[PDB]
Subunit: 488 residues, 3 copies
Amino acid sequence: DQICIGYHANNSTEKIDTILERNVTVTHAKDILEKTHNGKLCKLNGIPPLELGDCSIAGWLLGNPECDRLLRVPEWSYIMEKENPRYSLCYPGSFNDYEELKHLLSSVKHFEKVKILPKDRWTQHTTTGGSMACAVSGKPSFFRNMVWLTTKGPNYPVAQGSYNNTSGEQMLIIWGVHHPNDEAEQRALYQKVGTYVSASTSTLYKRSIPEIAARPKVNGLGSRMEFSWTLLDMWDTINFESTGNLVAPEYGFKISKRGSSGIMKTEGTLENCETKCQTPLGAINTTLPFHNVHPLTIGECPKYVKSEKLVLATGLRNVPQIAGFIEGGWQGMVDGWYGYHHSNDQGSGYAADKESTQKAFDGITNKVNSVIEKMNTQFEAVGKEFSNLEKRLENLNKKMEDGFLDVWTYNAELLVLMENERTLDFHDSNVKNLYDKVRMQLRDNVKELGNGCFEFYHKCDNECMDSVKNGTYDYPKYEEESKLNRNE
Amino acid sequence: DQICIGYHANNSTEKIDTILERNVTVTHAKDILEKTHNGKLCKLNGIPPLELGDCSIAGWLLGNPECDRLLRVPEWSYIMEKENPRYSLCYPGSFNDYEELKHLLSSVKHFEKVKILPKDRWTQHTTTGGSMACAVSGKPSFFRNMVWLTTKGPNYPVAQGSYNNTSGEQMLIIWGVHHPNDEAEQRALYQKVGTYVSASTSTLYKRSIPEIAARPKVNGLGSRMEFSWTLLDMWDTINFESTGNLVAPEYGFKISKRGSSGIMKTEGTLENCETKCQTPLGAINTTLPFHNVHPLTIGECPKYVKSEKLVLATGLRNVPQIAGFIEGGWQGMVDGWYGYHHSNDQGSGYAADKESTQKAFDGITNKVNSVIEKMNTQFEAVGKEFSNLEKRLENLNKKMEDGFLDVWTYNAELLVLMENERTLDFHDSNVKNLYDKVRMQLRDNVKELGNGCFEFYHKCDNECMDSVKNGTYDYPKYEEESKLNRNE
Amino acid sequence: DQICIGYHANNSTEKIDTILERNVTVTHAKDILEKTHNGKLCKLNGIPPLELGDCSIAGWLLGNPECDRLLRVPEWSYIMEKENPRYSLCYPGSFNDYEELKHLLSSVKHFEKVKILPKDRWTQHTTTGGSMACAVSGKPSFFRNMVWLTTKGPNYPVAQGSYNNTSGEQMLIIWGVHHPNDEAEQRALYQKVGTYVSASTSTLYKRSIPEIAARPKVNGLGSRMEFSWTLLDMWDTINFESTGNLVAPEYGFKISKRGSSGIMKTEGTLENCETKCQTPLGAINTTLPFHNVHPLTIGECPKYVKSEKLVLATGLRNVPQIAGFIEGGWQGMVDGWYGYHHSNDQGSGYAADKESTQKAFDGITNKVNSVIEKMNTQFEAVGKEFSNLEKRLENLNKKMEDGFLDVWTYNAELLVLMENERTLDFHDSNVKNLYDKVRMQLRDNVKELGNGCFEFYHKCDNECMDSVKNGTYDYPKYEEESKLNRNE
Ligand SMILES: *[C@@H]1O[C@H](CO)[C@@H](O)[C@H](O)[C@H]1NC(C)=O
Ligand SMILES: *[C@@H]1O[C@H](CO)[C@@H](O)[C@H](O)[C@H]1NC(C)=O
Ligand SMILES: *[C@@H]1O[C@H](CO)[C@@H](O)[C@H](O)[C@H]1NC(C)=O
Ligand SMILES: *[C@@H]1O[C@H](CO)[C@@H](O)[C@H](O)[C@H]1NC(C)=O
Ligand SMILES: *[C@@H]1O[C@H](CO)[C@@H](O)[C@H](O)[C@H]1NC(C)=O
Ligand SMILES: *[C@@H]1O[C@H](CO)[C@@H](O)[C@H](O)[C@H]1NC(C)=O
Ligand SMILES: *[C@@H]1O[C@H](CO)[C@@H](O)[C@H](O)[C@H]1NC(C)=O
Ligand SMILES: *[C@@H]1O[C@H](CO)[C@@H](O)[C@H](O)[C@H]1NC(C)=O
Ligand SMILES: *[C@@H]1O[C@H](CO)[C@@H](O)[C@H](O)[C@H]1NC(C)=O
Ligand SMILES: *[C@@H]1O[C@H](CO)[C@@H](O)[C@H](O)[C@H]1NC(C)=O
Ligand SMILES: *[C@@H]1O[C@H](CO)[C@@H](O)[C@H](O)[C@H]1NC(C)=O
């Protein structure tokens, strides 16, 4: 008769890392890092994004002639833009607080264009101005959302216009100021010099004076156009007054839907799929708490770490080898993790200890859940733009993001490295504890063999082996025969 | 005769969380999170705060006629300001670099008001101007710390004034520029058009031009007043020159005491209590690392986390059931953690080991003290204000704060879980070591019963048990009759 | 004859820290913190730094008459500046976006000075202006890289000048505007009132108007000079136009070499040594992962923490005491860590177990390397400069730096403590495992003595002892002899 205690082994080739040892083969493992994407851009939560194409944000809002598709834009989930868009400000110039506007458009999901100042209301000016830079079919043209006021005959009266925000939400209004090349242009266009442009609301007041100078030619013109924007609150009035050089707005953008969005810089094209997490390289369909695809994610997504391998051990060490756990594992005990092997006269087979296996299984599952179900990630549509005179702010942002990434990478790496040690020691501690429990139950009626096995002095049938496995071993009832056989 | 090794059990209820199991009942536990406050705004370190009431900082520093109780204010610990104050600027307008001023006030604890430009020195202008927007008892009035200069007769000379800072500390000076509504109001107030206001110091030069335009009416007026501020250094001079539209100062604010203060946005009122850690919801009185009351605190305030429960286990696992440490804990052993139970003919009672319990106590205490005392933080204010043209900066600050708090939350949770697991394993290891030491010392004169209890072969008296409990047991002394009784 | 199991002890007095114990003596330990520097400023990677002296960045770039040794500056690795430079703008004034220029200079390692507008091209103006503040040898002078334009006779024609960037890289250009003290000197210098200065590129437009006002006298003069800078891209043109008050540039700075550099604020001089990291207090020649000299460094440098000591335990617990291991360590085992001691008829002596010692050594080395070789050492927390109106941004930078530095200090301390505890427990477990291995192999043939020492029941000679040492012990061979001696 003989009973042995050992652990389960199989043909797995999975490896882990530990703070003491490297490349340790295990029976089971769980990868908690995602490294695969579909390489495609598609709909987030069922709502397609806003594809700008070769246009820019300023070109879309101002109404570039070469962006006529984006004049009635439906709802969107995120905005796709190119790094160096071609269709941009048609007339050379600038755009004040451009980055602030782009940041505002990261929490806006829909716009509704209202006509606030109709073109025909300017009955004392000429409103059919154009330029060769912004040309369609050879003929000169201009922005579709702005009006260029010019003299009607040799006189340019004071231009006055107002609008009361009775739409139902905040409104985005853009106006421009013209900077000619020479005094001859100013006289030919506005008939007077020393002009001003004045825009004022209940919070904003602004005066601008045209500045005439010879400039390097961009797009073939030495003139420039400067654009500014404001955010009009509900039930508030905006006032325009100018003696010249005013590029008035004809449409106002009302914020219809708010939420979480962002601008994602790609060179790609929308395709047909759905997703819940989006990266500039592709979508992610995963449930693990880590990934290393791309830092700039849009939507609820797993955390980003700069790691190539994060594997958690959920099984025993694979040391293949009748002996017991001192020699190695068993490749025939496919019922659990810790078990026995009886060798009596009426049979020779393996088994599993249900209680210890269940306890260890619950512990490992709880550990995996605790490591996984402890990280809280919000929407976090990161990504901000800074101008060429804001380099310190850009460096600050970059340093903050990199610092947090390094902190989290170190945290995750060391956590996995320590917990793999803990589980690998937990398993052999459990095996030794089971061996000690069996030895304490058996007392001196058996004979330790040194390889993890026990040799019985009394002939033990299958029922007595079952009693030993359960825990109801009756030492006194086999005591006398054991003594007689041992003393002999 | 028997001797057993076991541990202590009681009727405790406190639960802890480990990394392998959840809701483990323990004998002793320590809470390292505080969630209670008195809901009252108190005096920090015995100095009452500054109750602005319905006034803004601009109203206090400019002399709003209805904020007349703040003309002379004593020392303060922090400033309490409502979220939307209602007496800020009776005359509509703007304050330049307002948030910078509010940040500067976070390091100032006392102001002394010094008359720098007396109102009677302007002997060539009119200094009694007023408006209905700032009205007292119905009659028109104006700010109490500023002077409005107006034509005396049908002429307006150049207004010149200077002050040399011979006070003893840095000075704060506020001036303003008036922007009228129409040309008639400019002519009826300053008699000339095309005026300027020039303010200059050794490190500052600034010239402003009045703006005349029709604007929407706020408080019944279409005109605006724009205010600016500067910090005058010691032994430095400030010059004022204006041909119109100047709202000159009369008082300057000198920084008397410097320190660490802050602005708290609350709607409450000050009560009679003393406090070292103040939050917008109440006061904290605790000696613990973490809390979960409010992020924006002021004072020597404990660390902040987003967790609801952080309990450290400083005791044994509570499992009740004469058996030993295998079958569970003991409810009769009251004077220690580990111990022995013995049963002679001359007595049957409990005991407790001293060296082992003392070592365990010292280790647990050192662990708790290390976790508590490594977290070193100081007193600083975390509130910052940003304007509506600075939203990227606001998002940067918000993201940095949130990220740091999530990092510390993760650190605290992992620390507590892993340390609880290690402590609960440490207790079992200590008990097993005690059992092993006793067994090694007793050698073969005894017989293991398998439930942690040892049964002697020879008769053992009280002195023998006292000898086996401390580490001096004479195996040769009882060897011979132990053999005689065993072999029988 | 007996065989015993014990561990190594020696005369080291090194101490390490543990999460459960303080000041624990260990046989071997490794220090991973560097606290020493050579107290010198010298060459970084073979390139000497730029010694400004009493110069300033603006004084060097403008051509201060006393800042005359840096008119032809070779390659540099970092810039050494003083906290309060004395040779600075000799004509009083300001410098717009100074901190942005200083930030840009942190990524440029070489400049080349190109004559873009020769001083002889101004044939219709006077170009020999000077001031007593900006003085050499008593007689008046001016900056050496700028031209002051003044009327030639009683006439100031329209100044005009352009440059096309055909150099090869980006160019930095600085110009200035003069702000006089009174109308008399404006007329005596520029012959007209109501002047302007226009500078324009393909991406920059600017118009400035002089400000005439009496000002406090700094450096003896009541007038000021305001300077501005731009970054001209390749194949781009800059246009200058002025009717007065223009300080035109004569040279432009080409960015010859780019890289990683910085500005270090010290008060010392350059000496003759060669380093790889540089701190304001000295230089570091180390390979350790950490240091605590100064937060601001330049070069490949270890991480900075607020720690007084960080020592990793790589040895056993020094417990000086043949007994074995229950009583203490051995001072005679000079070979390895764990070993045996035999005492038979032939002789006595110590030995060492090669397998256990090698396994433990490899594990400890792997742990040390994992702690050290997991910290991202790319660069450090650079030093940024902010103005007096950017206090909020400076506070943000300071708080982020402090938060990250605190987080890393806490992480390193807790890592060291927990690793030390686990190392000591690891050594204890290894010794116990060796003891249990020998006991299981030897079984009943021996009797245990209770202090780590086994006594045989037969004659175990040198062949026997070498057999037991390397795990090949024939229990059947001596079974009958052991039974004979045991039973009797
Ligand atoms: C490992 O054994 C399993 C049997 O459970 C088998 O399905 C699998 O294919 C084997 N793996 C390899 C690589 O042969
Ligand atoms: C572990 O395996 C990797 C291959 O994935 C190898 O580069 C590395 O050297 C191995 N380490 C050890 C200790 O065998
Ligand atoms: C704008 O309209 C609202 C209601 O539609 C009205 O209360 C408000 O007075 C109007 N604004 C002005 C300046 O009249
Ligand atoms: C632990 O106990 C708390 C009691 O507040 C309960 O809410 C929670 O669900 C319990 N968790 C488990 C895993 O039993
Ligand atoms: C201001 O007063 C100080 C004396 O406290 C004097 O030294 C200084 O010259 C004065 N400033 C001016 C501009 O006269
Ligand atoms: C604060 O707690 C201490 C206990 O340390 C107590 O003595 C004191 O009365 C408490 N004060 C208040 C205001 O609760
Ligand atoms: C410790 O012992 C070593 C022998 O290897 C010796 O070289 C060293 O000087 C000793 N140190 C002290 C402090 O005794
Ligand atoms: C450890 O040693 C240091 C210096 O020798 C001493 O200040 C400290 O009190 C000691 N701590 C303990 C627990 O002995
Ligand atoms: C500047 O020079 C480049 C080539 O040297 C030329 O292509 C460009 O047209 C020039 N710029 C102007 C404004 O002529
Ligand atoms: C610097 O450290 C190196 C170790 O790589 C050493 O060889 C060299 O002598 C050291 N130089 C000085 C000046 O300390
Ligand atoms: C073990 O040592 C004995 C010496 O008694 C030697 O004969 C045998 O070859 C050794 N075996 C191994 C595996 O080193």
